[PDB]
Coordinates of C-alpha atoms (C1' of nucleotides) in Angstrom, one line a residue:
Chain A
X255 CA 108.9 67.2 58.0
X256 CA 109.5 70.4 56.1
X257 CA 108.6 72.6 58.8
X258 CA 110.6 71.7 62.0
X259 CA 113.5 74.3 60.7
X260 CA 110.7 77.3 60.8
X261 CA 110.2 79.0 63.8
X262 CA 106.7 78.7 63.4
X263 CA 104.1 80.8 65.0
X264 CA 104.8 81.5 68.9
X265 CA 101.7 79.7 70.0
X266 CA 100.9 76.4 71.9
X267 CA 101.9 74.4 69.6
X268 CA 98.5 72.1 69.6
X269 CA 96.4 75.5 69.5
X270 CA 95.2 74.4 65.9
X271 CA 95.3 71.2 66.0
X272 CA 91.8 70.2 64.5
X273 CA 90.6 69.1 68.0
X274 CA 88.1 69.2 70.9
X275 CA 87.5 72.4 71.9
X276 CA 87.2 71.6 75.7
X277 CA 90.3 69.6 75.5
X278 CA 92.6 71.1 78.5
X279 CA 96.0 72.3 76.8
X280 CA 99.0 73.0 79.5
X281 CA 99.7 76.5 78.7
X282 CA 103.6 76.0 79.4
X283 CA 105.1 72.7 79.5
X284 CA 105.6 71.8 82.7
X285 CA 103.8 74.6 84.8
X286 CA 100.6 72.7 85.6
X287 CA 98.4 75.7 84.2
X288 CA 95.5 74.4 82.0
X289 CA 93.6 76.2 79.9
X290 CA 90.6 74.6 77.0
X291 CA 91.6 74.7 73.5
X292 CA 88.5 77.0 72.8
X293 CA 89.6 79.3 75.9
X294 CA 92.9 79.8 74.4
X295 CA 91.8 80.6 70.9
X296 CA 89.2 83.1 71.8
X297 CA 92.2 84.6 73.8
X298 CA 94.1 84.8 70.5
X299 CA 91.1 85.8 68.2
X300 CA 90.7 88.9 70.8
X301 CA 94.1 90.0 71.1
X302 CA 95.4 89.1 67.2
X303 CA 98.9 90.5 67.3
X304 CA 98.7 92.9 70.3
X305 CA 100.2 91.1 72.5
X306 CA 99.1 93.5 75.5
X307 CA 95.3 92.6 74.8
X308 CA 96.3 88.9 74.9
X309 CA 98.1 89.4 78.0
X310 CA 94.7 91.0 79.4
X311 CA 92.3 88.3 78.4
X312 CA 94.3 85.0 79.4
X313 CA 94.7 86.9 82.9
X314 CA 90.9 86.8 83.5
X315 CA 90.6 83.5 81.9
X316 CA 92.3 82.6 84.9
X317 CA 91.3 85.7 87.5
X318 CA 87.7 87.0 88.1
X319 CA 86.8 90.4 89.1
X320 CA 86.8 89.7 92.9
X321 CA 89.8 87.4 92.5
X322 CA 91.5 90.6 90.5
X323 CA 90.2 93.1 92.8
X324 CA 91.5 91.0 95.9
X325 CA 95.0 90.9 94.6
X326 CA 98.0 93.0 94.5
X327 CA 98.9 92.2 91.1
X328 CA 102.5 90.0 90.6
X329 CA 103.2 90.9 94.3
X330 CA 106.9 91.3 93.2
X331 CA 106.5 93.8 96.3
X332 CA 103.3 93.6 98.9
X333 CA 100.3 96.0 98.3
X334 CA 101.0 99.9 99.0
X335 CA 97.1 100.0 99.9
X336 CA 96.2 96.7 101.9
X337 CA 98.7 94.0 103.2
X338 CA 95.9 91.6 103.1
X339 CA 95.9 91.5 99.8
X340 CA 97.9 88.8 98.3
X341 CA 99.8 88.3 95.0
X342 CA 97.9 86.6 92.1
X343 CA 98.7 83.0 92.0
X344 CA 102.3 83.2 91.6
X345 CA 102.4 79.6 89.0
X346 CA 99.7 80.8 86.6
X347 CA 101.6 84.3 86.3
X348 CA 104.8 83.0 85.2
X349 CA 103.2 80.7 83.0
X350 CA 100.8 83.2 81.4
X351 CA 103.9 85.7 81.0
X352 CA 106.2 83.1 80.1
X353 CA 103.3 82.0 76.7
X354 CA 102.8 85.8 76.1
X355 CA 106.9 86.8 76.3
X356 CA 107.0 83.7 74.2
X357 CA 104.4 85.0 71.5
X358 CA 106.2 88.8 71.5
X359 CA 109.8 88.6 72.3
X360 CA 109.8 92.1 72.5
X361 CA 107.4 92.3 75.8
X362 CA 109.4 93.0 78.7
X363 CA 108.6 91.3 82.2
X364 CA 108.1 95.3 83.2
X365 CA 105.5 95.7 81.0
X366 CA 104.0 92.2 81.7
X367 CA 103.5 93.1 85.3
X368 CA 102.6 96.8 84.8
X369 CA 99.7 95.4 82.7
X370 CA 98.3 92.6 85.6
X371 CA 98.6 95.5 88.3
X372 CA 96.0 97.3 85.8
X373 CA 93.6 94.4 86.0
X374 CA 93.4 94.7 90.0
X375 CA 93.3 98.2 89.4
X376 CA 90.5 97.9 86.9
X377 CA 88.9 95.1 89.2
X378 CA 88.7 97.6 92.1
X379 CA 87.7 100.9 90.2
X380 CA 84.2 98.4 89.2
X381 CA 83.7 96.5 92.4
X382 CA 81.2 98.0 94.5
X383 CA 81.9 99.0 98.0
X384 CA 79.8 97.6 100.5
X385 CA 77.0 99.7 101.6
X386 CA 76.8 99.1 105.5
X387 CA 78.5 101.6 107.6
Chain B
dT183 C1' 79.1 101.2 82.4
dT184 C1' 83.3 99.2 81.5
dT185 C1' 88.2 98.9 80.4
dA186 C1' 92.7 99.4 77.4
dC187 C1' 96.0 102.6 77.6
dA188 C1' 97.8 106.8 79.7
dT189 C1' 99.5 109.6 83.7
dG190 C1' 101.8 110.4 87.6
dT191 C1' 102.2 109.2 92.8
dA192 C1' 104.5 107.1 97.3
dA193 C1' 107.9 104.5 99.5
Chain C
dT84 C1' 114.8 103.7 89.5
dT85 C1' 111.1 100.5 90.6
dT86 C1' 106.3 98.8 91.4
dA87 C1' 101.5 98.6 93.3
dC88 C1' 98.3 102.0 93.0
dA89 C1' 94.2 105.3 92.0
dT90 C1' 92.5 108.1 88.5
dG91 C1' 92.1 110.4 83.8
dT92 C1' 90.7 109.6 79.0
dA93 C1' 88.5 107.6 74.9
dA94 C1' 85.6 104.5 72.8

DNA sequence: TTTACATGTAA
DNA sequence: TTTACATGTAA
């Protein structure tokens, strides 16, 4: 084919493959991370070309609020705050980050990470404390 | 109310 | 310098 030379666009590469939309692609070959063809698009359809927004929104495709809010981002180092809190799950990071340094060569891992300690962040700032003493 | 991005801290 | 973190800001 005429296109193998191209570098093509720096998305999974069955992403637009006229398919079923609940179809589980493997982010990253190899990782064990799934993700649904429709998942994955509205990721892409969010973000467009800001690669910081697409980032955001495959991390709470995999992460909810509590999840987030119960995490100490990458973990690269444990929690200033709370030892119990561990790091998020440590495969689906490195793929996520791996797809997104992927789609934006210029994204650096310090970035990448200063971005998923926001969503704990974020998570925290919304989750309400508990109201017994 | 929530959160993407900004700001600046503590160790 | 780095990294998890709380908070400030704008929409």
């Amino acid at each position: 084919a005429e296109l193998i030379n191209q570098i093509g666009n720096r998305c999974h590469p069955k992403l637009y493959d006229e398919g079923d939309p609940s179809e589980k692609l493997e982010l990253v070959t190899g990782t064990n991370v799934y993700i649904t063809r429709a998942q994955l698009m509205n990721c892409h359809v969010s973000a467009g070309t800001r690669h910081k927004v697409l980032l955001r929104r495959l991390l709470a495709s995999f992460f909810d609020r509590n999840t987030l809010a119960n995490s100490c981002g990458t973990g690269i180092r444990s929690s200033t705050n709370d030892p119990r809190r561990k790091p998020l799950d440590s495969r689906v990071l490195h793929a996520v980050k791996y797809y997104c340094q992927n789609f934006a060569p210029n994204f650096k891992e310090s970035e990448m990470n200063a971005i998923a300690a926001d969503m704990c962040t974020n998570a925290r700032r919304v989750v309400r404390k508990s109201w017994m003493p």
